[PDB]
């Protein structure tokens, strides 16, 4: 039928205060089929303490998942969400922009 590429939105639980612990969310939505892989990234390295929701889908049958990790933003560190999917030739990287 159809194939849809993931929308990828990265956002923090609380406003980003340097030094203050927080949560980093990656919301991957609007994709089809359900097969997907997602990593959260600290400075290019896959964060290993990552939780995610069970698979769900919206009114138009497109799938969505929430990935999240506690983190502590600094002015020097970079964070991102890495997604691969049949609609992507290479894993797409979406960096967090406070």
């Amino acid at each position: 039928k159809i194939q849809r590429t993931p929308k990828i939105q990265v956002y923090s639980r609380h406003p980003a205060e340097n030094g203050k612990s927080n949560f980093l969310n990656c919301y991957v939505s609007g994709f089809h089929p359900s097969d997907i892989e997602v990593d959260l990234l600290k400075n290019g390295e896959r964060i290993e303490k990552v939780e995610h929701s069970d698979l769900s889908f919206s009114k138009d049958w497109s799938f969505y998942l929430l990935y999240y990790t506690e983190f502590t933003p600094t002015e020097k560190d970079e964070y991102a969400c890495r997604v691969n999917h049949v609609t992507l030739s290479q894993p797409k990287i979406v960096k967090w922009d406070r």
Binding site: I2, H32, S34, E51, S56, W61
Partner: protein, 281 residues
């Protein structure tokens, strides 16, 4: 009322080839997950202490059995008919079924199925309704399913008798969590917008529950109807995040404020004030 009004189970079944299929499932109050399905065991994972509602363990066990049998048998039967329906692997089937409490108290039930991300069928009152997007496959499917003895009767009972009392009992059992009020945090940011001398102001609103929320850019009492709302995005802990943006001419940003209304604030709106005509002076 405040929290969720709908209970529903969802199914995602992926068929890789003629012998391998995998099914994931879960149960939800609106967009709040209260059940998981464990394919390790063919039983349900209750995510909240109250997730069984007012049902006895016997009736829960029976429902788990019905779901376990359905999930295993669905994939088997699909595999067996995949040739007759001219199916090409891989393909993916989705379904959702449940009931929703409406204003005035009526509870409406539903069942919908998809193939390849497109509508395929629905149920109206133990009748299988093929969706036009499903084409002749869906017409053939609904003609076949009515011949499996007793399955439409099971569906009808679950949709129209079991679900509504489950929904009521679980909304009552869960009320301390489902009717809690959690106050948002709000903060402002700014960015360049596409276009000359323009500027995007952003009002962030984060951590609220329940989900209905009101947020607008304002000049005094004048709602700025150019306000644009993003998606309402989830946090892990049953709250959400939302941004409201406003494209404004550089030099016209002064006098703007962001106003948040939420049931948790007991009438005391959040008001953040943008200071300066441009970026940040």
């Amino acid at each position: 009322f405040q929290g969720p009004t709908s209970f529903h189970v969802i199914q995602t079944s992926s068929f890789t080839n003629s012998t391998w299929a995998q099914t994931q499932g879960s149960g939800w109050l609106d967009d709040l997950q209260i059940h998981g399905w464990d394919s390790d065991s063919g039983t349900a994972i209750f995510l909240k202490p109250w997730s069984k509602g007012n049902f006895s363990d016997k009736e829960v066990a029976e429902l788990e059995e019905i779901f376990r049998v359905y999930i295993f048998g669905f994939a088997r039967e699909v595999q067996d008919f995949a040739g007759d329906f001219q199916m090409k692997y891989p393909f993916e089937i989705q379904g959702i079924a449940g009931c929703e409490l409406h204003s005035g108290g009526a509870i409406v039930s539903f069942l919908r199925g998809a193939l390849g991300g497109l509508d395929f069928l629905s149920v109206k009152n133990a009748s299988c309704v093929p969706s036009p997007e499903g084409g002749s496959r869906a017409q053939k499917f609904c003609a076949l399913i009515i011949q499996y003895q007793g399955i439409m009767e099971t569906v009808r009972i679950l949709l129209y008798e079991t679900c509504p009392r489950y929904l009521l009992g679980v909304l009552n059992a869960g009320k301390a969590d489902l009717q809690r009020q959690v106050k948002p945090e709000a903060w402002l940011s700014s960015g360049p917008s596409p276009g000359p001398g323009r500027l995007q102001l952003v009002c962030h609103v984060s951590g609220f529950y329940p989900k209905p929320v009101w947020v607008m850019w304002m000049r005094g009492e004048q709602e700025q109807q150019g306000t644009q709302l993003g998606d309402i995005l989830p946090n892990a802990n049953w709250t959400w995040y939302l941004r409201a943006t406003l494209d404004v001419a550089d030099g016209e940003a002064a006098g703007l404020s962001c106003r948040v209304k939420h049931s948790s604030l007991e009438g005391q709106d959040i008001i953040l004030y943008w200071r300066g005509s441009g970026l940040n002076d």
